């Protein structure tokens, strides 16, 4: 659980910042596709609860 | 236990002063997906 | 002896060892499948949906000012835009997933639009024999990477039989030139043609 | 290897309108070494 606590918050800290998402930086939104593509959201919700 | 002695390093490699860098973040993840064994194998999956 | 622009090629893989050409139907069944060609002696495979013309080829930063906005030979580390010669549309990497196993393996299909988001691919040299800047010779091992998704066009063996998908496994690919610039008034393979002397018809069990 | 490296520097600036100070100092560098190597090329062939 501590290892997966490290694999998660690394990629959270590689998420492109919000002001670059307001601009149409296609490279920056390509990455934000990939990290969202990897992880299902509802997996977190059972973990968060 | 052993693999967690690198990610605590690399989470200082892209996140500084409460902000993310760009040029390192756009090249760590391009390289982290060349060897998908580097992720934990329960999500590589359960 | 070297590849160029505006000349059709056919992507073929290798897996006993067996050569799978990559074709796709279009106008219905927009996804792509595989088709073998190593058993051409007992059964001729269908090459009608396997032709692919390279109508453009740019450098990596070169298309970057196409998106915000006659025969050039091509190199490793260039970008490429394939066209499906029968269906007059372009190959791309699609949004969905035909894996359904959380493999994060994207599915390869076709696209009608000429937008440059997912239509483009970059090639890469397989070994350290060649590198960036060198030309592609005829019959060299290639690795094709997405532009929008940054995944590799690879064969997948997991789900029963074999199929092609975009995920994080690299797979060698032969480009195999199939038709260069032909002279006018002459015949090559793939030509649809008539046989007069009065045509050569069949009946509308019609044999 | 110099040739593609200078050409892709054009494609980054092909969308921009004006050029700032540091953009030219880089581009002043790459041609000053380019004039050196064409001059070093032609002395291989100045003799017939």
UniProtKB/Swiss-Prot annotation, chain C:
Post-translational modification remark: The N-terminus is blocked. Channel activity is modulated by phosphorylation.
Disulfide cross-links: none
Compartments reported by the entry: Sarcoplasmic reticulum membrane
Tissues expressing the protein: Detected in skeletal muscle (at protein level). Fast- or slow-twitch skeletal muscle.
Superkingdom per UniProt: Eukaryota
Limits of the MIR domain: 71-126, 133-178
Role this protein plays: Cytosolic calcium-activated calcium channel that mediates the release of Ca(2+) from the sarcoplasmic reticulum into the cytosol and thereby plays a key role in triggering muscle contraction following depolarization of T-tubules. Repeated very high-level exercise increases the open probability of the channel and leads to Ca(2+) leaking into the cytoplasm. Can also mediate the release of Ca(2+) from intracellular stores in neurons, and may thereby promote prolonged Ca(2+) signaling in the brain. Required for normal embryonic development of muscle fibers and skeletal muscle.
Misc. comment: Binding of [3H]ryanodine indicates that the heterozygous channel is activated by Ca(2+) concentrations 4-fold lower than normal. Single-cell analysis of cotransfected cells shows a significantly increased resting cytoplasmic Ca(2+) level and a significantly reduced luminal Ca(2+) level.
Domain statement: The calcium release channel activity resides in the C-terminal region while the remaining part of the protein constitutes the 'foot' structure spanning the junctional gap between the sarcoplasmic reticulum (SR) and the T-tubule. Pore opening is mediated via the cytoplasmic calcium-binding domains that mediate a small rotation of the channel-forming transmembrane regions that then leads to channel opening.
Assembly behavior: Homotetramer. Can also form heterotetramers with RYR2. Identified in a complex composed of RYR1, PDE4D, PKA, FKBP1A and protein phosphatase 1 (PP1). Repeated very high-level exercise decreases interaction with PDE4D and protein phosphatase 1 (PP1). Interacts with CALM; CALM with bound calcium inhibits the RYR1 channel activity. Interacts with S100A1. Interacts with FKBP1A; this stabilizes the closed conformation of the channel. Interacts with CACNA1S; interaction with CACNA1S is important for activation of the RYR1 channel. Interacts with CACNB1.
Family from the record: Belongs to the ryanodine receptor (TC 1.A.3.1) family. RYR1 subfamily.
The name this protein goes by in its record: Ryanodine receptor 1
Organism: Oryctolagus cuniculus (Rabbit)
The encoding gene: RYR1
């Amino acid at each position: 659980m501590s290892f997966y606590a490290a694999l998660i918050d690394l990629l959270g800290r590689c998420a492109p910042e919000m002001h670059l998402i307001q601009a149409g930086k296609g490279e920056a939104l390509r990455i934000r596709a990939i990290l969202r593509s990897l992880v299902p959201l509802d997996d977190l919700v059972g973990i968060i609860s | 236990c052993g693999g967690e002695r690198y990610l605590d390093f690399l989470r200082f490699a892209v996140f500084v002063n409460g902000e993310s860098v760009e040029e390192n973040a756009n090249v760590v993840v391009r390289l982290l997906i060349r060897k998908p064994e580097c992720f934990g194998p329960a999500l590589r999956g359960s | 002896q070297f590849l160029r622009t505006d000349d059709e090629v056919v992507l073929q893989c290798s897996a006993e060892q067996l050569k799978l050409c990559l074709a796709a139907e279009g106008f219905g069944n927009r996804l792509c499948f595989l088709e073998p060609t190593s058993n051409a002696q007992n059964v001729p495979p269908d090459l009608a949906i396997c032709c692919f013309t390279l109508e453009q080829s740019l450098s990596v930063r070169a298309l970057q000012e196409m998106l915000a906005n006659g025969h050039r030979t091509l190199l490793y580390g260039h970008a490429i835009l394939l066209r499906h010669a029968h269906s007059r549309m372009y190959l791309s990497c699609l949004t969905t997933s035909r894996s359904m196993t959380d493999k994060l393996a994207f599915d390869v299909g076709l696209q009608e639009d000429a937008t440059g988001e997912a239509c483009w691919w970059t090639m890469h040299p397989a070994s350290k024999q060649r590198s960036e800047g060198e030309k592609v010779r005829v019959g060299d091992d290639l690795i094709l990477v997405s532009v929008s998704s940054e995944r590799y066009l690879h064969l997948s063996t997991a789900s029963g039989e074999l199929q092609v998908d975009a995920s994080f496994m690299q797979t060698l690919w032969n480009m195999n030139p199939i038709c260069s610039c032909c002279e006018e008034g002459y015949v090559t393979g793939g030509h649809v043609l008539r046989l007069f002397h009065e045509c050569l018809t069949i009946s509308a069990q019609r044999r | 290897r110099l040739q593609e490296s200078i050409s892709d520097f054009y494609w980054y600036y092909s969308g921009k309108d004006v050029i700032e100070e540091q953009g030219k100092r880089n581009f002043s560098k790459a041609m000053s070494v380019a004039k050196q190597v064409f001059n070093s090329l032609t002395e291989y062939i100045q003799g017939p």
